[PDB]
Structures are given as C-alpha cells and as structure tokens.
Design a protein around this nucleic acid. Sequence first.
RNA 1: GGACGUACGUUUCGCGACUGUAGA
RNA 2: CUACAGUCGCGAAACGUACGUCC
Lengths: 647, 631, 178, 178
Amino acid sequence: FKPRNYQLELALPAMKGKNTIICAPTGCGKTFVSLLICEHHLKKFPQGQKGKVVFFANQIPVYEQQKSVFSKYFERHGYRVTGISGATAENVPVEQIVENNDIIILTPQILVNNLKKGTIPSLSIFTLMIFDECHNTSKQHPYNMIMFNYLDQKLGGSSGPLPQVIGLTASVGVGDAKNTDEALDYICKLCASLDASVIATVKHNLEELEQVVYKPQKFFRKVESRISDKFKYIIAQLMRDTESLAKRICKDLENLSQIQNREFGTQKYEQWIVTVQKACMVFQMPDKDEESRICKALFLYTSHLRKYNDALIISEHARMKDALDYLKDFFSNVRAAGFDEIEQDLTQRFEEKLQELESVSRDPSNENPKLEDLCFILQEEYHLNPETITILFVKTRALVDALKNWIEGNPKLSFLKPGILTDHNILIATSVIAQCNLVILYEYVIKMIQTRGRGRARGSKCFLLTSNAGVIEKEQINMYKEKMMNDSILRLQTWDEAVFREKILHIQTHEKFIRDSQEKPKPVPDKENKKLLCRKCKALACYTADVRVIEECHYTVLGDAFKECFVSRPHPKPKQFSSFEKRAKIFCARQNCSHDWGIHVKYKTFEIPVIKIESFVVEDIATGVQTLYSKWKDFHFEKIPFDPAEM
Amino acid sequence: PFKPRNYQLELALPAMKGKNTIICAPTGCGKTFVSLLICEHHLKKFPQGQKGKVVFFANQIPVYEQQKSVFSKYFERHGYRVTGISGATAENVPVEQIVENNDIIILTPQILVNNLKKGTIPSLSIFTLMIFDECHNTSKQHPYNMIMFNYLDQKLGGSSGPLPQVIGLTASVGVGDAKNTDEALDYICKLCASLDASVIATVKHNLEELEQVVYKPQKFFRKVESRISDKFKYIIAQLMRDTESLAKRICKDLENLSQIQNREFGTQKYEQWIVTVQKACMVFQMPDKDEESRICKALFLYTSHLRKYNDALIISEHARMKDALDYLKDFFSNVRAAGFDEIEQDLTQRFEEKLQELESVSRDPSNENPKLEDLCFILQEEYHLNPETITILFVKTRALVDALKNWIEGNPKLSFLKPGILDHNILIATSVCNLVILYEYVRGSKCFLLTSNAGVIEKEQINMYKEKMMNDSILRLQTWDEAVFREKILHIQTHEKFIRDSQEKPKPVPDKENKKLLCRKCKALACYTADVRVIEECHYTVLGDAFKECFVSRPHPKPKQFSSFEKRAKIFCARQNCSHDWGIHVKYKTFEIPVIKIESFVVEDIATGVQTLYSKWKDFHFEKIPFDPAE
Amino acid sequence: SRFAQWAIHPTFNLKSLSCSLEVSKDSRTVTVSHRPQPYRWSCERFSTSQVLCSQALSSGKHYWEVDTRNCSHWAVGVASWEMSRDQVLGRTMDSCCVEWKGTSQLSAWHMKETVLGSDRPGVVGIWLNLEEGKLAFYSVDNQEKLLYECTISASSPLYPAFWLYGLHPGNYLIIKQV
Amino acid sequence: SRFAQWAIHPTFNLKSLSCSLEVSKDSRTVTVSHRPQPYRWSCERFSTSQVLCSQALSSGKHYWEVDTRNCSHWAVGVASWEMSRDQVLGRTMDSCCVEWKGTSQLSAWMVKETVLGSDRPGVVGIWLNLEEGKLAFYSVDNQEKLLYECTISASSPLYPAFWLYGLHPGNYLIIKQV
RNA sequence: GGACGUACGUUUCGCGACUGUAGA
RNA sequence: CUACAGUCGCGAAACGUACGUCC
Ligand SMILES: [Zn+2]
Ligand SMILES: [Zn+2]
C-alpha cells in the first residue's frame, strides 16, 4: 500500500512526461507503478483538461484483474473507470464510452477494429497510452499497429496534439537473435518502435530485488532409451501391411513426393505422410467418380498410416498403454461416422492385431526407461522432502493426460493427485502459481514467468529430462543467452540520451521509410468463377459465384442446396468472436464422407455456414486444374462483401 | 635429408601390410616423409618380370612442383624414372608414353580426369598405388571424387583385374556439416567409404614425441564494439536516400521487383537487393524504343552508383574512413572521365556538394574506428615484449589488405613494422611466426581474433568443439572390426553407386530460332544469334561487317597472347555514353575479329519479344555453329 | 578392533542390488554409476538406491564397521529379505538405522524421527545383539558412543541395506574390518 | 623501514591511465581488465598499457616501494609530465626504469639498454636522491642491492610511472607500506 | 472460423567475396 | 576467353509439426 524507492525510483523519470520501457519483475509492483503514474497524471490536471488515458492489456484475466484494481482504487478520487471486453463489443455506441470516462482499459484488437471503423480518427482523443507487456511490440502486433499509426502521425509532417506512449513490460526478450550485437540491436529496435528515449531499470534497490525474485536453479536429468521394443515391431508390421496394400491404385507415390528414405516413428515420417497426402490430393482422372472413389479410399489409407505414426511417437515418448488407448479411441471414432470395405478390412485387421497389442503392452518389463528414471528421480525427491507438491511441463498437451494416468494408478508414487488447469498434489500444464517448489519439464527444449505477488523464493527444483543431445546443446547455449542479454542491457546502460536520441531517430526514420514504401494494394481479383471440391470426397459442392465475405476475414456460402449439402452438429464449446455466437460445426453430406467443412455461426438471427479453405481444393472450370490454397488470404478471387438484405 | 623417427614408421605401417589406409598425419612435412617411406617400401618389394607404378596426386601447382622436386631428388639415386605432368607442359611425348615409361608420376588430378574422359588411357588398372594428397577435399564433385567415381565403377559390378591401393594423406579429416557426434561419425564413414579405405590410423603411442613438431598456440578473443559518432554513415545514408528517391521517381514500381523485405544501407543484404533490382530493370519490354534508352540508362546508372555507395559503406565499417573516401574519389574520377551526361552531372554535383564536409569529417582523430585502435594496441604492446616476432595478420577481402598496408605505412606510432602483402615484420595475407592476428576471419605463440559482429567468437568456439568431436569420432571408429567395417562401407559404396548411376539425364533441346542481342545498359541492337560463331568450343565472335560500326575499340597498350591467339585490344559500345565492356579484339591466326562474351548482354527473342538475362553460354541454348575460316 | 568383535565382514548380494550399482569383485566395495546399467527385469530387483547383503544372521553375536566417508548423504541400517521392493528403508516397521539428513542433522527412522545434533561420522560401527534386542552404533572416536539403542524382536534375518543419494556420480561405499 | 625513510606512497593520476587498466576504488592498486572500458577520450590518454602517478617530486629526498608480484612482465620507473604519450615508457630521454623483458631479464633503460642477470624480484624499491642526481632500485631483502644507478638532474617533476603487460586479465601491481 | 507471436524439423533457389584447376 | 572446382558469408520463397493468445 506504501511505495518504496524500489517502486518510486521507477516513476521518478516517468513523471517528467516521457515514454519508457521500464521493466519490473514484480506483478503487484508493476500494477503499483502504473497506478502511481496514473495518479500523477490525474492529479496534475488543471481545469479544462481531465483524464482520457488508456491502459492496454493483452489477455482477458490480466484485463479483468486490472479493471478490478483500477475501479477499486480510482472510485473515491473522482474518476470513472470503464472497460471493454469481448462481451462489450456489441450493442453500444463506442465513442461515448471513449469520451465519458477517463481510465478506459480496452484490449488493443478492438482499438485496431475501430481505427478500421473511423471512430477515434486521431489518437489525440487520448492523452496517455499505458502499454502492459510491451515486449510483444515486435512486428505486426496490434501494439505495433497502434505504434504505426502514432509514428506516421508524429513523424509524418502533420504534427499536432500527440499523446504520450509510456510502456511497461516484464523482461525484454531476445527474440530471434543469437549474438550480443543483435541483442543490442533488438533491444534498441524495441526502444525505437515504442518512442523510448529511456530505459528505466532497478539499480539501487538490488536488495529489494533479491528478496522477491524467485530465481531457482537448473536441474537437467540425463537418460538412455529403450532396446526391447515390441509395439514398434507390431505397428511397423501393420504399417508395412497397410502401405503395401494401399499401392494397388497408386504406384508413383514415392515419385510424387520428393522426400527421401523415411524412417518408422520420426517427425520426418509425418512430413513424408502429409507430403504424399498433398501429393495424392491432386489426382485428376476424367471419370470424376472413380476419381472420387479412389481418392476417398487412399484418403482412408493415408489417414490410417498417419494415426499409426502418431501411435509410434506416443509410444516413443509416453507409455505403451497411451498409444494403445489412442489408437483404440481412433478406431472408436471411425466406428461412429461411416464404414467402407477399405475401412472394414482395416478395422478387422486392427482387431486381429489388437489382442497381441493388449497382451504385449501389459508386460511390466516393457516400461519406458525415460519413465523409469523419471519415477526414480521423483522418489529421490520424495525421499529428500515428502512435502513438495509437484507441477510438470511437457512439450505437448497430449502427454499431460498421459502423465495424469501415469499418476492415476501408480502404487510406487501414490502421493500424487491430479489437478489439470491448462488442493492439488500434481498438475501438468504445457506452456506459460510459484507457491509450489517443483516443476518438471520432460522432453522440452524468455523463460518461465513464475512471479506474481510479493512473496519469497526459499528454494526449488526444476527437473528437465533429456533423451537426446539437442536439449543439452541448445539449453546450455540458452543459459549463456540469459547471460548475454544481461550483458546486452549492461551495454545499453553506458550511453548518452542525445546519442540514443539520434540513434532512434535514424532507426525510426528508416522504419518510416520502409513502411511507407511497403504500400502494395490488393492485386487484380479473379472474376473467373472457379469451382470448389471436397478434399476427401472430390465432390463438387460450391463455386466462387456463391461465396460471400463478411468482414474481410470470414467466407460464407450463399448456396441453399449447399445448406442441405452438409450436416449440422452442435459445438462442444460454443462462444463468440466479435460478431457471432458459435452454434455448431458442419460435416460434409455424402454417402459416408464426414469431412469437417467449417463452422456454423449465429450472427443476428440467421445460422450462417462460415467455411474454411483448409477443407477444400480449388479447381478451375476453363481447364480444370485443382490447386490448393491453404490460407484464405492467398485465394485471390472476386471477393463479394456480405449482403444481409437478401435473406 | 631428414631422419625416420618412430611415429613416422607407425603411421606408415598400416599401409605396408597392403590395405588402403587414410593417414591422419599432422603438418610439418611428416606426411611428405611418410609418402616417401611408403613409396620406397612399395616399389622395393615387387618380384622380377613385373614392376610397380605409383601416382602422387597434388592439387596446387606449387605443391606439385615441390613434390616433383623432392621425389626426383630422393629417387634419382635408386634408378627410378621420376617424372611429372601438369597444365604447363607442352603437347609432345604423350601420356601413353609417359605412364608407360616411368615409375613415379606426379599428376594434378584434372589431367587424369581428362585422359579417363576421352578414353586415351583405358582405366586405372595400369596403376598400382594412387596416393591422394589432402584427401579430405574428396567431396561433392571434386576431381578426387571423379577419379573415385571411375575407380568404384570399375570395382563394383564388372570386376576387372588388379586395382590400385588408394592411400590418403590428410592432416585433419574434417567433420564439417555435422552437429552431433553421430553425424560426425556419419561424415567420416562417408569420406572413408568414398576413398575405398579401411584404416584411419593416427599416432597413438608416441604422442609426446609428436608434439615437438606440431604446436597449438593458445588463443585470445578480443571483441570490440562499433562506433557511435557515425557521421560518415549519416552523410552516405543521405546521399543514398536521395539517389534512391530519384530512381523511385523514374521507376514507380521498384518495391515490386524484389522480395527482400527489410533493406538497410551498408550490409551484404542491400547489395543482394541492388543486384536483383539491376537484373530486374535490365529486362524491359515497352514498345517505345527511345523511351527504353532513357529508362534503362537511368536505372543502370542509379543502381550502379547505389552499389558503389554500398561498397563504400562496407569498406568503411572495417578500416579507416579515408580508405572509403579514396575509393569513392577514384570511382568518381573514373566515371567523370568516361562520359558526359545530364544524370552523371547531377550525381557528380550532388556528391561534390557534400565532398568538402565529408573530407573534413574523415580527416579527424576523433572519428576513428575503434577496431583499428585495438589492433594498434595489440601490435604495439606485443612487439614491445619481443621485438623480433613476425606476424601473419589475415584479412577477408583484397581491398582491406591494400587499405591496411596503407594504414600501417601511414602511422606515427607504428614505425617499426615493415609490411608485405600476399626483411619483413608482418604479412597482410588473405588465406595462405609468433602472432597470427585474425581480422574478422572464419615457440610460445598467440592467436588473437578481433571482431565487431559477435558470432565470430561463437563460430570459432564451435569450431574448437568440432575438432574435439573429430578426435572423439576418430577414436570411436578406431575400435571397430575390419570385416563389418568393410561391409558397412561396401553398403555405402553400393548406395552411392545407385544414386549417382540414376539421374544423369540433363538432355538439352536446341532452340532452333534466331535472336538478337542487345547492349546491357543502352539497349542498342548489337548483332544476331544467326551470325555468331563457335571457334574452338571456347570463344564466340560475330562474323559481320554491319557489326563493325556498332563498336569502337580502345587500344590496349601491351599486346598479349593466348595459347593459340594474340589479344590486341578491348572493344566498347559505340553509343553516346554507353562505353560498355563488351569484349576483347583478337586475331584468329591470320586476320582480325572481335570476340564478345555473354555476361554484358541480353537475349531478346524475335518472335515472343521477351528478354532474358544469361550468364554462361553453357546455360544459354542456340545452334552452336562451328566457325568456318573461309568467311 | 579393541572391544567385542563378533561378526564377519559382510558382502553385498549380487541379485538384490539396485539397477545402478556396479559393485566390484572384491565384493565389499560399491561405486555408483554415471549412468545406470539397465539389468534384467525381475521382482527381486529393489528399484531404489539400495543394495542388500546375503549373510544370514546368527544366534546373538554380531558387530560390523563400514566406511561412510566420501558420500554426501548415506543411510545404513537393517532390513529383512521379505521387505517390499518399492518401499525405501525408513518407511517400514522392520527398520532401525542411522540418518545424516540433508538439513545437517543426525536423525534416524525407527518404528520415527529421532534427531540428534549436527554430528557427522566418517566411519560407523554397528553392534547387533539378538539375545535381548540390544543394538548399538559405536561410530567413531566419541568414546564409543552408541547414542541410541533399538530393540528388534524379528523372525527373519536383518541384512544391512545400504542407501545413498544416488545422483552423485563418483560416490563409493566400502565395507572394511570389524 | 630500516634505512633513511623519507617519502610518501603515491596515487595514480586518473586523467592519464589508458583505457585498459582499471585501478580500483581504493585508488592505490593498479589492475588490468578483461576487455577495455571506453572512457572520455582526451589528448592525455596513453593508448599503451601504462600509468602515471600524481605527486611532483622534491629536492633531495624521495623513496617508494612497489610490489611487482602478480604480473607476467612489468616495468617500474619515473617519468616527467612532458612525455610523448604514444611512446613506450623508458624509451625517451625523460625516464629511467627497470624492465622484465620477454626473455626473463632484469633489463634497465638516459636511453641505454643494459641486460642484467636472471633475477626476478618480488618487490621493487626505488630510492631517489636528487640532491646528488641518484636513482637506485633496491629490490627487497638484498642488503640494498642497487640493481642500477642513473643520473637525471631535471627541473621537472619525476612521478613514479609504471608499465605492465596489458594482455593478461588478472595482471595487477600493488603499492604497499614501507 | 480467421489474425498474431514463439519454438522444432525438412526440401530447394538465387547473391556476393575468398581460394585453386584444366583447355584454349 | 571459355570453363568446371571447393570453402565462406548474407539472404528470399514453398512447407509440415508443436505450443499459446486474442478478436
Ligand atoms: Zn463429399
Ligand atoms: Zn550500349
């Protein structure tokens, strides 16, 4: 509640009316500094000038926490705090909410949306912009879009009442740099894109820094992998079988993708499979129905080989039971939707091998040595002190539930209890609170931001498990990279304000020049009506003469027979994004197709099928060439904006 | 001569058995003594009726001459017919006589590739011992690998008679392109398979006896940061912004022409961008032909001046500023004496506006490159200890060697040095003694390494780690069994024979058409493809008389001669301000014809009208008509 | 070697040791691994940082001394053959032992944490008497101070199980003279 | 502290040391850095690895003592303020010194190169008697072995001036009490 | 649906400089 | 002059995968 020099020396240069990239590690202290500079800006106001500041936060929980704290404090001092979330984007006139408040906490995506609209034409309507976590102002961010507007309004030669752009972040980040010279160029570029004449950093309160920082130590763990693998042999036999039997209509598949000799159970094998998938997508037999039948059968073939590769990798990382259950769940999934003779042969073949899988996967000698030594070092930890709640970080969300079930039913380590949040002894989250001193990253190569309150550290362990030298090399380099980014800020601290001013004047003039050169408009749209076909059916479903565009991001189909050429099935997680409410997903309606075409939205009163280009092949009508645009932004055609007046 | 020690027998011994080694002897003429021992022991052991035949490949002409001299001077006593062949010998006493009439041949390997290509020598069965020097260069398409392609294609498959014992003679087997130890083992297996080799014997026992020959100097890294008062870069950025604005005003489509997103002044990326812009604006098609003259000439001139400014910036970031200023001033005197032009007068005026303030900025002790001050600190402080040391300072380009020699000759503090480029104190040499100072390059001697761009330090420390990886993988491979190792390299050789023996169809299709070539910056219509001639598959010339007006020459003061011609003078474009470097003027053997090269030209198609930018006549297709002397 | 010497020098069993250990042919000296050797999967592998002897005990007469230096954290105590594999020593009702803890305390786990001061022995001599249940740890040079006595009325032999912090490569334990 | 004790211990002039040496905040101990540290460049910098003191000398009485331990190759002597700044110490007519050269000699420079024997001092003691124009390097414990004698009757200050080999991070010299 | 950011890995493509070779 | 050759340095495009985040 009371500010120290640990937090007042931060506001000491900021109170002059300048812009800074102050980096504090505390969360409550960062919020205290933002409240401090907001209070200093509000209290300095003469009559004629009142508060019109804006506070940018990125994610929704930080936004709601800041709305709670800023409406809690600045209610007594005669100021009106309002905020904008997803649920506030509709049914209100936005400009009155800009004007009739002082401390608006809106998320930057909706400000970029309203810069597209026309509301707030110049940013003089605000006098302050307070950015949170401004190290994400790297390139093409909405933060960087706002800074593009402010920089071309200040530097452009149309100089008027420009606002201040004081920013705040937690740690600068190295980004895409390997060398300390590029670390300096990165940090100075981050000052340049934010109009930062100064970097404020803690120098005289290093003791108050060292009390609350929570900096624990490295704990890499080093392990050799298995020799006696049977599931790899049986699944390799099934993959030999399925790939060999698949080739009866397609011989040139090895000639059709340029990938070299693939290995069973690697990432490059999945690259091989998806490349031969995109290869066999483009077969163009003039039958157009045997084309459909043949392409559907080989679609079944390559999808099954892909899922078998996923089972291989899951066994390579996690327990054999996890791969077994995942393939069983996949066959239960394919058991629900449709059935074909290719599929019936593959299901009866899987049921043939399934009993041997369930036999050999239940041998306790087939435990993974990575898992064995992981259990070993964990029982070492629980022999050191049995009162440590453990939290883990794995590479992927798939091995989260795998290690949940590794806990669920473990007699050797029965003092762990599941707590998934992606009164809990164990929790596994995948990617980035600090009151439990145990984090275990298993097969995983800015570090983890585990500091929110004004707590303490008192020790921790951070167990990382290694099975290849890649994490060893890259993470020892990365510990040296933490050392040289500390060296990077210690090199930046040895300058003058004027030479930094002309340096950022060079860089800002350069970036203004390049941004003003890069002004390519949209190219000539294709007015040629092309057709679309399903990827797994090769069924003509729609054209480009019946596809609308809502807000230059979304693409709908006006076909009403197209409305009965899919099937609608309600969403497992219905929600909104800026115009809508999701109601359902839609699958392709054929004999046994069940391809995921898109999403079904509720806009005002309709139920509109927003489709995706990812489940589509774009075919010519004049010649008939079936090309494959993967993102909607690269399918250049005559885009027709949306018409609600029709229906 | 010298004397045989113990390790120089230990290295030689695995080849004395009669198996194809790869010797990993370190430098210090131990390898050229070991080759002597192995050649002596091999030739001395044959029975009567037959006799041996050695061939020692060397790669560089001085290394060839040195090994020819020592293999004559060591085996003249025994009565061995030493010889040698290179590119410098004359066409007489042919190779069929020489390899039949000698005992120890020293080739440079392109000669044997030539003879095996044109079928004059049958195959390698006439030889009995091929000694490859610097065998760790056996790679993608190197001449050692071409001879190895022929030797493996004889061995595998249609098995012929006796084949020669390959012996390598590297000094480090080069684990490059590898990251982890398995890939380093893959590299040494790939190389040792590609030489038909089985034993990679190094010294193991008398290692302490070795180190009186080789010596590893201890290193120091001295990273120094850049400048801050970069007024030179500011003024040059001003000039570049101005001329780039002029070029953008006369083009209005410039940022469509290359996909390079972010281009700053004074790197290598800007030079890639300006080259791509030049190659885009050199091809144009718009049916206003005298508009094309102004457009192409203006774009070539602006791009050429921008490229010169970019090179001036690159030179100024690694030397003193006065070197870049002298470079620009020599360039501007070379462009002002060339022609008269509105654009050239505009650029000369815009430079010589800023000229006097630029040279006032350059002639300054404060605006000094701190890298050169750190070098002067090192050279001062080291030579104050041992004033007899000599220094082999390495630099990157050539212009930096000339600039640093000018800098050492022109300094107050550095009076006691006597430089010499490549009796002398230091040697300012790029890519050939107690001080081996590296200037940004990737008893009791030291090896410093100055840099500004961090990452040079990282590449040198990664290279030291790679040497340790090389030693570890050599030691791991030295413990295998020979039979499984022979089978492993037999599978690698078979896989490589299958890959190489499968994709050799770059079949050309002759575009039997007629095209007209244009000048590269003025777009004058030069000649026709129907009137060019291929003389001896090397040179190309225009047998026309209407062409004889379209170029005006310039007399080259000394004459010259080829192997079969006599070059007289250069020739140039006869237009108003083009003066382009087309080619040279030569005589065949009787009369005079102009000979041109495809680098400074475009190929304008007659029918379609499109123009393309070629660089090799091997790349460009047409009716290559052999020249007839009767015309 | 001046009071009552009663037992023989113990010797580690070659089938109830850990997965990690590479105990020498001298068979009174164990040294830890730098990466463990994966052995054959059996139900008699203890799967801990443990190793057991094979000397079946006697009527009442036992005393043995082992070198406990050059180890960060060790654990010496007695255990029966039919003890559960996944359970570590110090977690059962069949154990009396000595524990030089991680927090610089000489504790023990017995039937319960019996903490002493911060005394670290270098060599420990365990004295076992099965006639009346008298047990003594005559460790080193502290006027043969046992400092605690435990009483075990068991029905099985009580083989010394040797535990150590199994994550320090280079650690070694020795059995030496009584 | 047994012969005629006359003079004071000096302090390095921080306007005159070059960019490499980084004399600590106690300000009587000269030490080399790991990498240079860019300070405000003046004309009075050295661009060498040298250092000057601050105190102008006297009529007939000066002496100080310097510890030449912890150094590869060092040189200690005197110099006048009007010294050519880019020039090495001891190679003008403005200086006498003693230098520990590359071939391990106690050489001394009145520019005149005289090699001495292979005795490496730990401690160097400079005695000045400008009343008679005398300068002598009694090292330590040698029953006052003079190790050189040079004559300079200058009209300038003769500050204690030091050179040390500035490429060995960890090289440092100490002034200590008489 | 789409936007953005980060990381891993693969397959090519041109550019500039340095070094050397054979034919003519 | 043709013409291969090996190394270095900086790049640009077409990708798959993994995580998160918002609108
Ligand atoms: Zn369909
Ligand atoms: Zn021309």
